[PDB]
Amino acid sequence: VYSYTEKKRIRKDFGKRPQVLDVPYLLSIQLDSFQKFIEQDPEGQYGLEAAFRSVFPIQSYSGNSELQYVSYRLGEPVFDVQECQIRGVTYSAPLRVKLRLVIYEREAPEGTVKDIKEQEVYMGEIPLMTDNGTFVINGTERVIVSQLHRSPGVFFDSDKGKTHSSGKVLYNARIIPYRGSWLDFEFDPKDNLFVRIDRRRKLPATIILRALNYTTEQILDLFFEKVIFEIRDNKLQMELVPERLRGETASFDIEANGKVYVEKGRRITARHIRQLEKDDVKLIEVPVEYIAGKVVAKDYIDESTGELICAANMELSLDLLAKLSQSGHKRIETLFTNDLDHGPYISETLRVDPTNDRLSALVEIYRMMRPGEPPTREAAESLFENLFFSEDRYDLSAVGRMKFNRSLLREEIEGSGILSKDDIIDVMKKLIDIRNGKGEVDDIDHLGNRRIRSVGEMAENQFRVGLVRVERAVKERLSLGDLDTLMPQDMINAKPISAAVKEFFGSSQLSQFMDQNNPLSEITHKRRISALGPGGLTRERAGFEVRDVHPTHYGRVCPIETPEGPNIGLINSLSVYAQTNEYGFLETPYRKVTDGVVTDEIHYLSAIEEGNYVIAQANSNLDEEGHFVEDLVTCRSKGESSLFSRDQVDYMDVSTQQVVSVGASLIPFLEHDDANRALMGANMQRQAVPTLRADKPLVGTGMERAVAVDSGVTAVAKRGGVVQYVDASRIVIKVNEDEMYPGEAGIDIYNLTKYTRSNQNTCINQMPCVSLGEPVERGDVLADGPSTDLGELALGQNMRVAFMPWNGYNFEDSILVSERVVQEDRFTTIHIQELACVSRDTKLGPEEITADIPNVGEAALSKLDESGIVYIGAEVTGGDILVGKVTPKVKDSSLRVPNGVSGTVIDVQVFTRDGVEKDKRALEIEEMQLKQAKKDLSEELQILEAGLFSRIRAVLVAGGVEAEKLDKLPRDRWLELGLTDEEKQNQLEQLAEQYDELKHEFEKKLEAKRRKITQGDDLAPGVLKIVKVYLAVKRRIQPGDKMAGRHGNKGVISKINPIEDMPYDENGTPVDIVLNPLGVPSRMNIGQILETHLGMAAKGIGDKINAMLKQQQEVAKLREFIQRAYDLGADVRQKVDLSTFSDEEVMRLAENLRKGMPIATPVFDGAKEAEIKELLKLGDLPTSGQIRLYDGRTGEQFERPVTVGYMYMLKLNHLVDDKMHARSTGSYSLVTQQPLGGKAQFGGQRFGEMEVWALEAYGAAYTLQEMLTVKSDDVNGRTKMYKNIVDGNHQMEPGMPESFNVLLKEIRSLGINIELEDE
């Protein structure tokens, strides 16, 4: 089976693996995100609902007047997308909110005084998302790029090594909350624990412990274990957990009820510990003159006097032992302390404490957070209770709580959104546990600690900032307010909401100016995953590890598609099958494996989940029965690959593509290329530029169809049906029956978009690709777009290439091209510039747009109408006058085509602020656009009304027909009919009433449309009317353009030979490009050769069919041959039963193949050499793939075969007439009399610091003294130089550089004094 358009040119498909999960819709990120941001959803949970329900209700300072939320609504936009782009306003939507204001009975219980509900207070506008995923801000078309940052959570890092050189490692532990203040714990090389907050300074961690109202005894209890001593007969016998000794070598006897196990000195063996635990003998005597080297648990004041005996956490000594045994504290508790397992860390830090109580602690914290102030007690109380415990200024999310509890082995996943004593303590415990020698630091690349936001997250957050900025003012007015003499819509002022959300969608390190020169460029730029922006690292701090590719990127983030240069590794593209988990971790598909069967059950997995299971790999020969045909297979387990048993696997890859992005899965034979060149290939492909005459790629990879359709640059049909009227402007489809709505539905109408500007000045354009009277299925192309063809992606063109060094003209990489190319116009691009001409009424007067001009006569003014603006069509050049603008004196402020830029004017826009006249050509274009709007919208409704007459006269026809009673009268006799008084007469009467209503509706609709098109929308303050002109250059190809393959072989075209001189082959065809073979071995991209050979096979099949069809052959031969070509190949999934097409439907297929039978090559399951050979031999070409070529000059065989074939090349857009530039003398700058910089401004180069070093290196000094004096700075000398030059004398006069004179004046402006001495 095939979708009826594929039956046109059915692409042949090598490839062996069955595909189970088709390519998904390539814009899920953008579309789901925003659809989620803006959609009525109950129970909070990620929407404007969440935002509001969080910030509201707003209550006065107990004044019992309160404001609360109800619902909200979104009116339809005041325009549509296309009109919106054309005019310039955003593509916005109004925001209505139902609010409720209540007041309780003053001086009483909660007696509701009054509740007025202002219907839908208006609080601003938020843009929408076009069905392509692009916002429209000011006439242009922008995109928001998803950001990648650190999972709000907790982390345990090492920072091994590099610090303190001591060989010792640290262990810091951080808490990064979603919104608020950070928190860090860290050690110091003396094992001293320290908290810090917001990166300010250091503090002794126990300070914040004690700040959380803990007494030292509580602290020691909570962290350390215990050790029990009794003042018995003597020597104060001790309790001993046997294990507690294994790390500590003993220095006294070790017995049990006399039964000695070890005598003084040695370590302990686990056999001994087992014996002892078997024995239970613990209450044992100890050498008393030893324990003095320990630490006390609590405070043992006197039983009787309670004197200041001992402070907790203090050393010991037998004098103190007696000082306490005076009253005989028969129970002493100490802290178990190992120096390998369990260390005294907190004890030592507690000693280093400056403070001793809660209040002093709070004081210290307040003083570090705010330098220089006497702390008020409860003020500091507020400061602390407001950083880590208040719903307001600190918030993890669900995300934070999940990742947190996960890191702490807690039970649940839900919980509060603020910290707690439990939490901080548990973090400290875990940190200590690490320093002890269990558990492991995480790392900060593993994609379980790194997360994807999107447009939804962003806009939601920024809007929240809006609401808090409004609640402060609302709360204020409400506190200082009065009794309900003001309705809600006067409390709230939307201007902050609007301004903030505009700030975001208009000026961000994210919202950027969408690349648009190319379908693939759009669909890459929307899937981009950047690591920059607020809340993220920046291009001067990123080290090396974030830039490297960690082994969990596999299948979630591309390895190869990425810019090169400054920001490598931060602009990760996003894989094909990738999806966003519920919380926001990148997760990928996999196939569930039961005991021995590879199911077809997909199943998604995140990063960390993948760690435990064992995963197969894409290309593992399984046979027909869900069984791996071998019994041990390559697999990957925990960031590690190996070979495993047949029975251990659990999950298998989905397809073979899933490791790359749609940036670089259009690269046939990718797996025969080094990573480097695949990379540069992906990029250059992204920078193609639409040609003039698109053309399928002879050697593609089965993803073209997806990228094209599922981008937004082609006209896809919405309801299957039949074409009724085609045209380069519109397409009109008659819907089928069943897919049609019941009520007076009608037909469909697509407005193809004819020539218009793209954000890169290239052209954008659409063409019909179906002929009159023809079926179309749902979800199908009806108009090729820029760089598309019959619905496939086509960036460049396929030309006949031959690899051989040819007389130097292809020295390094310089492609050499034959004039056949430029003649046939198969690289002739199309560009468009957009000039501008505005008019502000100023002080000293207004400005009209007349055509009255001094210094030039009709010889120049001709091309203008008598109204002033240029005619549509005149071939203008550099210096002509596009608009006549005059300024009150009169001074000329006209508008001219800048130098160089040729043109051919195609369109003129005129905006005008409502309240001004419309001069002559304004009126002309005005009534023209009225006629346009009429014959467009009205005429649309006219064909619609025709079809509608058909439907309702069929209401008069189909069934109880009035054939003779109805054919005579025109189609107007339907309202008052008296016929079969059943449902047909009921329908007649009521629907005809409805229809006179519809006549009125027609009228009101058209009138509304005229009204719109008449209103003159807003502008910049102080401006009257804006005239815009467009131009359309047309660029051929010429020594200097940069052409490029898809495999990363660049090259600057370097000469244009005549047809005579190409290398021709024995049958006469020249060869159209000549590359340079030396470029293959080094840059180890052996791929482009395989591309070439398979290409030649393709064109072989082509020429064969071409002959068979030119001889006007019968059809049997064609079915046979086509069938054979689709059938060869080892064992492929392609299977076309060509014998089930209509005889006509084949002749059409040959017609579209005669240029060359396209071929697939799914990326990592390509075609093999064996099949390439067999395909060639199906053709009639030599197996090796090399021909002999003669030589256009001497006509004598090159001395050994060469490689000719077809290859797909692209015209990158660094066009040479955009680069080239020159300058003799012109505009000088203003503060430092140097020349300007750039091309538009007619500037000059930058003789920079490194060049000056060079010149100094040569002995040359006059060249340098010149290029620092006469060419640039000395005013006086500059002019005098020019004068001498024209007189014929060459000589300079140094003088002194004005820029230095400026330096003098500035330093002198400081207090300093700088002179020039005398000689």
């Binding site: 060094p805 080094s1082 040359a1260």
Partner: protein, 653 residues
């Protein structure tokens, strides 16, 4: 400035001055009414800190915000930093009379001249044009002639040629690392819009043709023209001041050419016929009787300059190959014929050029370089050396070798599974055995390439070096090396992992056959490591060069002989392993300090103020003395400079 319309872009200066002046007026006010002291103290403090702002914002705690959100620029910032005057408008500045464009190839140029676009030129030399015009009287004044050039009438182009004729320009490439990145040329006018640049200089500029750009500057004054003609034109830099090794080293296409041009097969058309001179060798190769490389005898005549400057001829029958003679028709007079007899790889052709230099001077070397290039390109193209899949040959033993290695792996795996070895030596054992297999396969492929061709001699069989296009491009030294031809044919070895550890399963497959996915995906971070490294490398190295030039700046060779008897000592470097640098090349061209006594004492071998060039080094080798004292710039004893003799040869002369 009046921006578009009526508004005025606020300048940080204007702003800050305005603020301090308001503050000051208020403070004068409050001292006209004897207001209270708290108020006057507040006012004074505000004023002090506002002046602090004006002078150096950002230095006193927190900067004052700008008009929008971001600190605004004060005087100190207007001086210092990457964008103050000293680094933005004094050290290096913008420049009239210049232009920029894309570069391309043009292999028809003598190496002292470069293409140049027409349009771009007529826009550069507008002044000199106006001159020559009103000199010939074809006009009246400036403005008339300006109309002339605007029109581009039929005369202007002729006069443009007339003023181009001899007038050097400077070409420059953007990141000028070192002196050779600004050179001179004479212009030849061309259509199109791309600067055409001779090919033997791409090496020096480090300029591939993948879309780089070059700037052109014009010299105006007369001293400056003489400059570009005496110090900067490409025919006066054929030695790099780094190390006196040539810089016109021919490059990829041209060496593939000469190579295929001079290399014996065993049996092609025209065997053993004897020829009367390079001339008729060429005449054969054209009419197609003999083949470009066929063992043959010829009569050649070479000149040797044994006399005190006189050239003596001698002839003889050498044994050679047709193509090799046809090369010989170029070589200038006095060089032994044994210079072009061998295979002519890259190293060898460089050796040829350099000996030609040392013996015959300069002009012969320049002209001989240009002829190398022409004949090279010509016979390369005439060869047609392509590359195709069939020419990367798999060793037929690779499968066997790698299976055997796999088995040994499994054996170690068992010896561990039964618990007889530690994971440590297990790891090490496996990695070593894979390395061994790697080397075995590499041997295999290199063998089967280099000897591949086996053919018959009018006898039975015989083996010779091959003609396998990829082997050829790798044996000439044009591109690649053993390493990369390995990575095309045989396995591509072990690939590192991000940290520095090394993964224990090599990429069993090469680039001709495919790569299954996981293999490719390892190779990725293998490569991205370095590719991402290179950028930060660039930045940091730039910084290094900057600081270096700003400490070694003042130092100009001022006097002529400090006349001192200090100095340092020189011995060749020995690092436990073999000697690394010979004493010869550490002492080439550097003025001695004390007469070097022959090991037989009282046998003074060299004076103390000599200039040790090649022949004196030979004498040193003869008596084999191997510890020589010598004068070094660190010891010279001259004020404010460095004396000539203490600095030695000037490499590049």
């Amino acid at each position: 400035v009046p921006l578009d319309g009526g508004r005025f872009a606020t300048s940080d200066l204007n702003d800050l001055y305005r603020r301090v002046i308001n503050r000051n007026n208020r403070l004068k006010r409050l001292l006209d009414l004897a207001a209270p002291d708290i108020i006057v103290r507040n006012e004074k403090r505000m004023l002090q800190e506002a002046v602090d702002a004006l002078l150096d914002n950002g230095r006193r705690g927190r900067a004052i915000t700008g008009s929008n959100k971001r600190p605004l620029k004060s005087l100190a910032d207007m001086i210092k930093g990457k964008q103050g005057r000293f680094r933005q408008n004094l050290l290096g500045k913008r420049v009239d009379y210049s232009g920029r464009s894309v570069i391309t190839v043009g292999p028809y140029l003598r190496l002292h001249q470069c293409g140049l676009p027409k349009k771009m030129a007529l826009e550069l030399f507008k002044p000199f044009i106006y001159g020559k015009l009103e000199l010939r009287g074809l006009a009246t004044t400036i403005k008339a002639a300006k109309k002339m050039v605007e029109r581009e009438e039929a005369v202007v182009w002729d006069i443009l040629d007339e003023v181009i004729r001899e007038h050097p320009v400077l070409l420059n490439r953007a990141p000028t690392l070192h002196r050779l990145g600004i050179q001179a040329f004479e212009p030849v006018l061309i259509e199109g819009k791309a600067i055409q640049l001779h090919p033997l200089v791409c090496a020096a500029y480090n300029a591939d043709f993948d879309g780089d750009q070059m700037a052109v500057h014009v010299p105006l004054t007369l001293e400056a023209q003489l400059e570009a003609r005496a110090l900067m034109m490409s025919t006066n830099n054929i030695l790099s001041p780094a190390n006196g090794e040539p810089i016109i080293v021919p490059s990829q296409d041209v060496v593939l050419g000469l190579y295929y041009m001079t290399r014996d097969c065993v049996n092609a058309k025209g065997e053993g016929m004897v020829l009367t001179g390079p001339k008729e060798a060429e005449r054969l190769y054209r009419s197609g009787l003999a083949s470009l490389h066929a063992r043959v005898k010829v009569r050649i005549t070479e000149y040797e300059k044994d006399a005190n400057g006189e050239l003596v001829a001698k002839t003889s029958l050498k044994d050679t190959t047709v193509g090799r003679a046809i090369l010989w028709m170029i070589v200038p007079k006095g060089l032994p014929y044994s210079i072009v007899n061998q295979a002519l790889g890259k190293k060898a052709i460089s050796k040829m050029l350099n000996t030609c230099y040392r013996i015959l001077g300069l002009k012969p070397t320049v002209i001989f370089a240009d002829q190398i290039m022409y004949t090279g390109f010509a016979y390369a193209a005439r060869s047609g050396a392509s590359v195709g899949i069939d020419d990367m040959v798999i060793p037929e033993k690779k499968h066997e070798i790698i299976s055997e290695a796999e088995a040994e792996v499994a054996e170690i795996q068992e010896q561990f599974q039964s618990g007889l070895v530690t994971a440590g030596e297990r790891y090490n054992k496996v990695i070593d055995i894979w390395a061994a297999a790697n080397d075995r396969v590499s041997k295999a492929m290199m063998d089967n390439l280099q000897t591949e061709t086996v053919i018959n001699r009018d006898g039975q069989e015989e083996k010779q070096v091959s003609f396998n296009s990829i082997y050829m491009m790798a044996d000439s030294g044009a591109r690649g090396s053993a390493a990369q031809i390995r990575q095309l044919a045989g396995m591509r070895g072990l690939m590192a992992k991000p940290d520095g550890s090394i993964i224990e399963t090599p990429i069993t497959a090469n680039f001709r056959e495919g790569l299954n996915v996981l293999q490719y995906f390892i190779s990725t971070h293998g490569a991205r490591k370095g590719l991402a490294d290179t950028a930060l490398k660039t930045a940091n190295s730039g910084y290094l060069t900057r600081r270096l030039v700003d400490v070694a700046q003042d130092l100009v060779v001022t006097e002529d002989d400090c006349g001192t008897h200090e100095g340092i000592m020189m011995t060749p470097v020995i690092e436990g392993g073999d000697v690394k640098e010979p004493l010869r090349d550490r002492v080439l061209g550097r003025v001695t300090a004390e007469d070097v006594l022959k090991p037989g004492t009282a046998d003074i071998l060299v004076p103390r103020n000599t200039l040790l060039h090649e022949q004196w080094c030979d004498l040193l080798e003869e008596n084999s003395v191997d510890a020589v004292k010598v004068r070094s710039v660190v010891s010279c004893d001259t004020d404010f400079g460095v004396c000539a003799h203490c600095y030695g040869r000037d490499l590049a002369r």
